[PDB]
Paper text:
Most eukaryotes have two Rad51/RecA recombinases: Rad51, which is expressed constitutively, and Dmc1, which is only expressed in meiosis. Here, we present cryo-EM structures of S. cerevisiae Rad51 and Dmc1 nucleoprotein filaments in their ADP-bound states.
To solve the cryo-EM structures of S. cerevisiae Rad51 and Dmc1 in the ADP-bound states, we mixed the purified proteins with 96-nucleotide ssDNA oligonucleotide in the presence of 2 mM ADP. The extended helical pitches observed for the ADP-bound states of Rad51 and Dmc1 coincided with the disordered ssDNA density, consistent with a weakening of the protein–DNA contacts, as has been previously reported for human RAD51 (45, 46), strongly suggesting that this structural change is a conserved property of the eukaryotic members of the Rad51/RecA family. Previous studies have shown, mutation of H352 within S. cerevisiae Rad51 to alanine, tyrosine, phenylalanine, lysine, or methionine, severely compromises both ATP hydrolysis activity and nucleoprotein filament assembly at physiological pH. In the case of Rad51, residues R308, R312, and D315 interact in trans with residues T288, D289, and R251 of the adjacent protomer in the ATP-bound state. In addition, residue K216 from one protomer contacts residue E295 in the L1 DNA-binding loop of the adjacent protomer. All of these contacts are disrupted in the ADP-bound state. The stacked aromatic residues of Rad51 are maintained upon transition to the ADP-bound state, while Dmc1 S48 maintains the interaction with R248 and therefore S48 is relieved from L189 in the ADP-bound state.
Author numbering:
A (entry chain D): 80 to 290, 295 to 327, 346 to 400
B (entry chain C): 80 to 289, 294 to 327, 346 to 400
C (entry chain B): 81 to 290, 295 to 327, 344 to 400
D (entry chain A): 80 to 290, 296 to 327, 348 to 400
E (entry chain E): 81 to 288, 290, 296 to 327, 346 to 400
F (entry chain F): 80 to 287, 290, 295 to 327, 344 to 400
Write the structure that this text describes.
Amino acid sequence: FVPIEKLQVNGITMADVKKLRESGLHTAEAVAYAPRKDLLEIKGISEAKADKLLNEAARLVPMGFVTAADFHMRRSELICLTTGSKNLDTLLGGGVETGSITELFGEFRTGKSQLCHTLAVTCQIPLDIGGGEGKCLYIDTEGTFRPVRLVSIAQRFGLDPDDALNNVAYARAYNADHQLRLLDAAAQMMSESRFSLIVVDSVMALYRTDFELSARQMHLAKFMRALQRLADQFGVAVVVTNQVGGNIMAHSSTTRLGFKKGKGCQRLCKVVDSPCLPEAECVFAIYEDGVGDPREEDE
Amino acid sequence: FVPIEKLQVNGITMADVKKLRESGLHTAEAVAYAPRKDLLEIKGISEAKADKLLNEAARLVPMGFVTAADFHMRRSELICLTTGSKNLDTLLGGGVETGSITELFGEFRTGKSQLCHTLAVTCQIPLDIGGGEGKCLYIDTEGTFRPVRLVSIAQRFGLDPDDALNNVAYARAYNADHQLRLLDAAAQMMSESRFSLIVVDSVMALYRTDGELSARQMHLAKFMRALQRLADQFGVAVVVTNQVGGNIMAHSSTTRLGFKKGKGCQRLCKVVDSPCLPEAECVFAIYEDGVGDPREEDE
Amino acid sequence: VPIEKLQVNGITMADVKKLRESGLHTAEAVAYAPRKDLLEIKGISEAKADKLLNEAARLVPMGFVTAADFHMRRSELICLTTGSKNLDTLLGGGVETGSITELFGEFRTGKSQLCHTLAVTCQIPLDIGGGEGKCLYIDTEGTFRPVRLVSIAQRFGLDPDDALNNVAYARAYNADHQLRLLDAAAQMMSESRFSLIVVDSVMALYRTDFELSARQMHLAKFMRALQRLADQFGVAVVVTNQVPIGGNIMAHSSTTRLGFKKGKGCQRLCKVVDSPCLPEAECVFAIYEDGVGDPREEDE
Amino acid sequence: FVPIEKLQVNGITMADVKKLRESGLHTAEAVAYAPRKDLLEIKGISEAKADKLLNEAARLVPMGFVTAADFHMRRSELICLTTGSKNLDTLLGGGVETGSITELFGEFRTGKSQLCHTLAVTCQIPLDIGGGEGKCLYIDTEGTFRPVRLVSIAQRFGLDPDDALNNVAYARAYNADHQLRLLDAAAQMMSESRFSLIVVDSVMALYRTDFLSARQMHLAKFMRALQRLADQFGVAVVVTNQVNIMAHSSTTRLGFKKGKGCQRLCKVVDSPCLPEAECVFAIYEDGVGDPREEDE
Amino acid sequence: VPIEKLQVNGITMADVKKLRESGLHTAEAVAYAPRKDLLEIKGISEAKADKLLNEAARLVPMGFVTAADFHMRRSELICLTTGSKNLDTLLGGGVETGSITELFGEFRTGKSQLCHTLAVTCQIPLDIGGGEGKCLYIDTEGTFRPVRLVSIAQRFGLDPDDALNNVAYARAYNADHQLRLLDAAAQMMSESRFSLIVVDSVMALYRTFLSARQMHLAKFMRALQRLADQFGVAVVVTNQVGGNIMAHSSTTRLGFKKGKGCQRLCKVVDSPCLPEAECVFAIYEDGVGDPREEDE
Amino acid sequence: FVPIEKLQVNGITMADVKKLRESGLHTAEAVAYAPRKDLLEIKGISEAKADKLLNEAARLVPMGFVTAADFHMRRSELICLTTGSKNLDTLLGGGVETGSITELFGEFRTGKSQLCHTLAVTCQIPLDIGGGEGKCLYIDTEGTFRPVRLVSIAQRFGLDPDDALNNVAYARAYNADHQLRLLDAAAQMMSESRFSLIVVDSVMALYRFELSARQMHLAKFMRALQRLADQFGVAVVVTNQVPIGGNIMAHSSTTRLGFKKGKGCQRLCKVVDSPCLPEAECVFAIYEDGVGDPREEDE
Ligand SMILES: Nc1ncnc2c1ncn2[C@@H]1O[C@H](COP(=O)(O)OP(=O)(O)O)[C@@H](O)[C@H]1O
Ligand SMILES: Nc1ncnc2c1ncn2[C@@H]1O[C@H](COP(=O)(O)OP(=O)(O)O)[C@@H](O)[C@H]1O
Ligand SMILES: Nc1ncnc2c1ncn2[C@@H]1O[C@H](COP(=O)(O)OP(=O)(O)O)[C@@H](O)[C@H]1O
Ligand SMILES: Nc1ncnc2c1ncn2[C@@H]1O[C@H](COP(=O)(O)OP(=O)(O)O)[C@@H](O)[C@H]1O
Ligand SMILES: [Mg+2]
Ligand SMILES: [Mg+2]
Ligand SMILES: [Mg+2]
Ligand SMILES: [Mg+2]
């Protein structure tokens, strides 16, 4: 991404920069994608200078037309992260794709939290072996997150236990308003540092008891679009878990994966929906050290 | 169509042509269709020479009266793009007509994006099979375009895997203002070469996520009107996808096709609104290489 | 009455050509026009304008007319046939030749289908309700398809070739072009018999081009021109409207108004919202591939 | 009225009477009310002849003020025209009165055309039931006139349909000049046959498109001509309008408002003697009348 | 922390009393409460409620934190030993305080014995697996036998009078009484330090409820979760062999099987982090402990 | 215990008390332990009336928390019924605890009927020697009622045989509804007179139903038995054949005693379920005078 401090030019005061940052925008992409009406609504900003900064960002941030072959090259360039099972990578065609809010849904005790822990660890590892080189962002709504599993999985991957311990931002929410307030600080801290993943587990746990359906349904809509807005500005893959959101999950999520409890430690994962993948299923396994491919003993 | 650089006659200099270039009228047809008052509102153009260039444009572009024979022959000579499915081809009366807006709508995962991707390759094929011998353009709003689908489909008609990917302009919109802003750039770009298709997917996805209830319709009308002008200016097929506006989208779109999810790869299509087509219904199957007729194995 | 007929006791052809370029192509057009309009035209003197005015007035009756004579004259007016017996009975013969008829309602009500049906029928002989005159179609939304015309002609049995040969189309890209189309079309209404003008739609261009007052008197000018054409040539005029928006400018001009309501599938309800003569009522009609008609019992 | 034939006394030449008829003077009242200056303006009329005719006509009818004791009682026996509804008759205190000017203003679809049709059909019934015992004169300026209507209304009132249609004179104007010109033939018909009601519907419609000071002066000339015709021929005058000179010239003014269904609210606004009150009247296929109990 | 720190920024004592009437005994519940719940309280304005929430957030930590601090916080969490070191090793110190531990299995295996045993351990010092707090035992079948409590206290060396004078028994005859017992007990856990809640059982009353049972059970279970959150107290419940509805909120689940004589087998069936394994313990008159050579 | 008559305060009509008596609630303790619904379907009782009854019961009877010391001292003061044999009383901690569910299951013709008759006789002797000083109600279902044995045990303990016979109300059970009516009448005159022991021999004689419906109705019979025990603190003893019922009856049975037929008239009794008393065994004997300690001649 591009920092917002590289955007001010032609006698635009830093005070305007603070005013924009206090409103939630923290990068050039955020300003460029932001509608001009919202920028005008911010107090203490002239509309003429608002349009000046908007067109300066448009000159800086590229959003013009481009040939499809170039788009193919850029999409091949996109960072992709190994899940931890070669079968999963083959099914995903390389692994989890950033810039896309992937959803993993299914019945509980199928390894969703274990897979999320493995995802955080594989986002801690360097990009050379396919890692993300960035910090995760884990939002828990049930108290299930346990650092011991992270330590074990990191030791499987060989990373420093303390680096993995201190490079994950964990925050447990207690109500829907707490989640929404938490997202703002999440974005603010996202601004300064380099991250590579935002995992939420689970969105509906608090919403199930906080509610009155009409207020609940609209409250997710502004919540989820915040994750979508944050994903494109910073280019971080977004993973959402769920229990068995209706149409909101389907509309918001790009690639969906259903989970099923297989025999023993083996588990089934199915590509229910995808923009460029066929509906195919495969099998992985979960051990005390994380997530891997099923072994001959597991057969 | 009629290139703009051939209407210059009877004492109009290139300065007026450049002024029209900033005015947006990039074709003799465009200036002929534009109302006189808009020409008067253009700074630096006197009303006398405005009416002059208007009458040379009207001489060069026929605004007069045509019989049903002439317009019927022109209808016969209109270019239609093959849908890749004989059932769908017959449902559409032979393809997608020029200078008319098609609105595919329905619930998600019904294959609208697959239909758009399939159409994106039929334009470049030789016209004898039912193409248009041109180069496509893809304006996206949800980030679901995929060159890999074009790679897979180009082999159905034998097209080159890279000549298909270097002859498709691409761009993405992020906010409501950018969606309308892209159209002037599209018109400027398309004035140099024969485009044959435009895609907008989807229309109101940004408008729902953008008191505000009244203000969105007026913005929607301004954007949707611009597409209708674009089709008449250049004679190209524009395809807009919709999710489930109301009257604004119902009135503007020339043709409307509703999609429904069937069993497996089977999907149902119904002509919801057309001026000269019966309200029929057909079935089509999405395969690895695009949209096609259902197979006996899947039936 | 032909314009070339007005040549009496020394009408110079230069004055005739001046009238031609002034837009007046019918004897009624000069008979009804005020003298100030003639004086506003260059090359026209006041005394000669007055004498040509009286020469025009002595042909067409321009005085008191007893109500009985007006009633018998109006009862002889050719009523266009819409093919649907229900709607034809609703309006006492259908659309009348020489008055402004407006159709309005929500979307998906088949007004365009009715316009198409009237366009096809107005070419059939008088016995089957046609006007025996070529049709004119000013379109502002590109909703004309000359493929269905052949099918409708087959339903009405008249030959397809001459039925297609006997229509004129004009696409309208702007309100100024829409107004100029009437001036353009006046001469060919003065060249061969005409019985039907269709405009679709009225409000579409003014909705986008507009500022309220400017739109208001521009629409007033357009409606005045339409009424002038209807009076001069005696040709039926049908216009399409979508929903009212604009207030009363279209309500005062529109002699007849119909409102369309969605029914069940092919069923639609027509209600005479405004009419100086016929009482407010309602009726039902259906649309099929052959055109507008009365719904069948199976469709009920 | 008094025909101009008896005006000639002591060998007054018939040529002068013919010239007066060609000048719009068809009755002795017109000559009496005409000043000397317009008589001088007429070609072939001398000053001596002008003053002689003024003396002959003035000695027949007075012009100045009168004693109110006879004035109010003589105003009672004036011809009244019922509107077919008791609400309006009570509101007007006798209904429409001839020899005056009454305006009906309001929005469209308020029955103004319908009430004008009712007046035009009710002007022939005998005076015992609020009739007029005369023929109407309808001037139309929008094409709204639909004869058929009348037949049904006359059958409601029991008059013969053929007589109802044949005894109503109808004119249509295409321009303001044509509208003004029709008044010459109107005056000629007034001279030829007895009429007792005039309707204009609508007076202002053409002036919207035909035209500003020229428009105002033309309206003033039109209204003064109508007032004059009412003066000589004792014909009630009713005008229609859509929503200062017209109000000033008008004596009685009634505003119309749309009620519920067939019901509409009629209100008296300006009147020399009548108070300010409203009423409700219904309009049906048969015409204008009092609301039925079913609509209540 | 006590809600007494809330008396800042000019908010009156009356609001604190109203909150105490609604069970808002400690500041943790005030902070975790949603807006609507505190809005429902009578005599409370939303304007001051915004502040109330602000200082509630300031007093108790609510923002982001790195996982190192979370791990070191949960590592030093108080754990209550069961007297069976085999269990301790299996549970990594014993039962956690502030979470939900569920027991299921055959009644012949014996779980009420463990419920009795844990009652005294909450008072012994922390260095030997104690809690140093009060215990609140709720029974639904009247199995409370203080003689076993005296025996286990003598095994632990504590005074039986101290054991009987420190724990609080409560019995419920219905689901509503069970629900309101928690509300009543909130005052006692507010006024004094408690370190253990034992429920035996949770499905007994619900057996003698079908759809409304799930909502009632969810409310009761989330109330038990709230009590652990608002005071850091351990919560342990028993369940005879709910289902999935209990399973969602079940942080830890232990299944029991009957072995040879007094020997019993305990399996940690479900746990967020702990592996799936089994162990063996024994039951004697002194309580539940590690198996001895006599049972081997 | 608190009589139901004294419960009605503050406008509670006596007809409501009569309706409660007819329904089955004969004491204020029953209303105190009565739930919301059970009071709701009682005739003549409304929601406000039920709330008033519950409030009055809470005022009269302590409904809240009870400390361990108070519960222990109340249990200590509870009257225990002697068995007439030193060994059984020693194994039972002084005898049978009143107001508790005790099940005696064993082989037929092992003196279970004799033991029940002995307990019925000993529940009327003075408290100084472990008696009850109250009436007795013996419910027999197997036709084992023997007045001769009752007279013999009365002579053994010095009780007057006629005073022993008239102090015991004998009830024979034919059907499940019949025994429910019998226990309803039992509570009916318990509301007006004091008793000391309830004997049911045998429970499973009439149940052996429909297998599932047998459990809930038996549980309701167990539930009804517990209600009266808490209302009056009277010992209840039920005999079981050879245990039938399984989990439900095991949970209902607060204490269980298995019986075996030893040599001669001697019999063996062993505890099965006891939260406090450890499991052990004992031996007793049966003679014409009833059930007592074994003698040296049979030992
Ligand atoms: N320490 C561990 N070592 C190995 N496997 C474990 C461990 N803890 C849990 N599991 C496995 O993980 C599963 C729990 O899945 P989980 O990630 O909790 O799904 P959810 O979060 O949806 O409940 C259990 O079925 C169990 O078999
Ligand atoms: N390579 C493929 N082969 C066959 N079917 C596919 C392939 N890729 C996607 N599909 C199917 O086509 C559908 C595409 O739906 P889509 O056009 O994305 O709907 P929307 O545009 O409304 O989101 C998906 O449901 C998917 O199951
Ligand atoms: N050839 C045909 N056969 C049968 N039905 C048709 C045919 N053409 C159009 N229709 C149906 O009739 C309707 C016509 O409505 P339309 O004329 O578009 O109303 P409007 O012009 O007022 O928008 C359309 O909804 C269409 O589904
Ligand atoms: N044949 C008829 N039967 C019943 N009612 C009619 C008939 N003809 C006209 N009307 C009614 O008369 C009214 C005409 O109003 P109109 O007099 O034109 O008002 P305005 O003169 O103010 O425009 C219409 O509202 C209509 O309902
Ligand atoms: Mg989970
Ligand atoms: Mg799509
Ligand atoms: Mg249409
Ligand atoms: Mg009218």
